[PDB]
Amino acid sequence: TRYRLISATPSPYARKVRIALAEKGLPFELVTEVPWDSATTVPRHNPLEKLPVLLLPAGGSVYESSYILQWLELKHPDPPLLPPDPDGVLAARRYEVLCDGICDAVVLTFFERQRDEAGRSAPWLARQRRKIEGGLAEIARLLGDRDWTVGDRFTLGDIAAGTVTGYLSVRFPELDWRARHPNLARLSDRLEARPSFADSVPYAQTITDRVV
Amino acid sequence: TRYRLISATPSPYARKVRIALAEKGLPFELVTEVPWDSATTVPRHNPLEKLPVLLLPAGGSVYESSYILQWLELKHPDPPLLPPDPDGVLAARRYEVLCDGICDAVVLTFFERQRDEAGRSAPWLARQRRKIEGGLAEIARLLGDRDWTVGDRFTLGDIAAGTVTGYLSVRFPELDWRARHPNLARLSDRLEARPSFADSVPYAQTITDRVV
Ligand SMILES: N[C@@H](CCC(=O)N[C@@H](CS(=O)(=O)O)C(=O)NCC(=O)O)C(=O)O
Ligand SMILES: N[C@@H](CCC(=O)N[C@@H](CS(=O)(=O)O)C(=O)NCC(=O)O)C(=O)O
């Protein structure tokens, strides 16, 4: 069994999936696209026209990163990325909710800042910034002084925490997350040494087409 | 056991939760707010500053509608809103992914249309519209000629399909979904007669504060 994954170089949503595939020992081909350019092939698979898209070997696709991760956990349960118990499942998923919500607000911010300056909405930017900073502070609070986000070993919660912090350094660089949250700095440094992370570090892509 | 739910009258995300609580026979108090006004209390509970927020009786909260639904399924498994088998779980969740993605694009459209006309982005509007119409067409395709979205009985898939269609009639009224997708029209008519739906129909709220 092998997969193909439509991905973009900065994409945190795709990074979660890339990390999960590697952690589960599932081979895959990375199919890099700019999903904001008219050349993207995402609409052929995802009615929502977003990546990541997991392309299945016998045909069809799975989209929406959190859903792809649930799909992978059911199809390939070993090694697990979630704890076996419901409380642990829910704890890991809460980190993922926060990661995703922060990332959504970062993307909305990025595209607001692509508008002509005169047309940028200060209240919309401020609204999204409260989500970014407040969501991040909550991830840091939940981690506290512990070695792992959930329990005693690597889980989805660590995928989420490491992904969002790595993404902020690319697409919300003004926020000194390492200084405000040294616990996240230390966790990030541990996680970024894992091969799954080291093979998926974000960088900024080039967007050519007009989006806004 | 009883809950309080911070909700807004049009909110499809909150509607899914309101339907689920009622279908599971879980009493709750509806706490209606406009989450776009400065009076909202959502930030006291959700770092992402969104509703729905499920307020727990002994303290704390759960946010993000899909996560709230997963939480409810674990805490209150009977009666179930998901099939017992993994294929059925994944099928129901795919409808929820589509519902949520359509709703996200509707909200972005609504707020773009609140901008001064000269500042509205035609390409951004067009991008979101492809998600709305294409996502809806996929829900209709998946339902096909069957009585229920998933298997032989009411599930989360029906919550998703009925919620998104009811919401489009309020916040994307130009789209004649009943005419293009008579299967969804018929399903909607069945679902809207259920007490859980009939007690949660969306209507437009008043937004006073500037959002964009
Ligand atoms: N909720 C989705 C979000 C995915 C998403 O927004 N992807 C972006 C790319 S990236 O920001 O991750 O770089 C996309 O394809 N956007 C295209 C669009 O929204 O039209 C998920 O979790 O997969
Ligand atoms: N993904 C969230 C979306 C929730 C959401 O966007 N809620 C809106 C209200 S509504 O559109 O449902 O009416 C909100 O609180 N928005 C406030 C904000 O984004 O600042 C979920 O599924 O709960």
UniProtKB/TrEMBL annotation, chains A, B:
Stretches assigned to coiled coil: none
Molecular function terms, GO-annotated: transferase activity
Alphabetized UniProt keyword annotations: Transferase
Residue intervals of the GST C-terminal domain: 84-210
Domain GST N-terminal: 1-80
GO cellular component: cytoplasm
Gene3D superfamilies noted in UniProt: 1.20.1050.10, Glutaredoxin
SUPFAM superfamilies (UniProt xref): GST C-terminal domain-like, Thioredoxin-like
InterPro entries: Glutathione-S-Trfase_C-like, Glutathione-S-Trfase_C_sf, Glutathione_S-Trfase, Glutathione_S-Trfase_N, GST_Omega/HSP26, Thioredoxin-like_sf
PANTHER family: GLUTATHIONE S-TRANSFERASE OMEGA, PTHR43968
Name of the protein: Glutathione S-transferase domain protein
Originating species: Methylobacterium radiotolerans (strain ATCC 27329 / DSM 1819 / JCM 2831 / NBRC 15690 / NCIMB 10815 / 0-1)
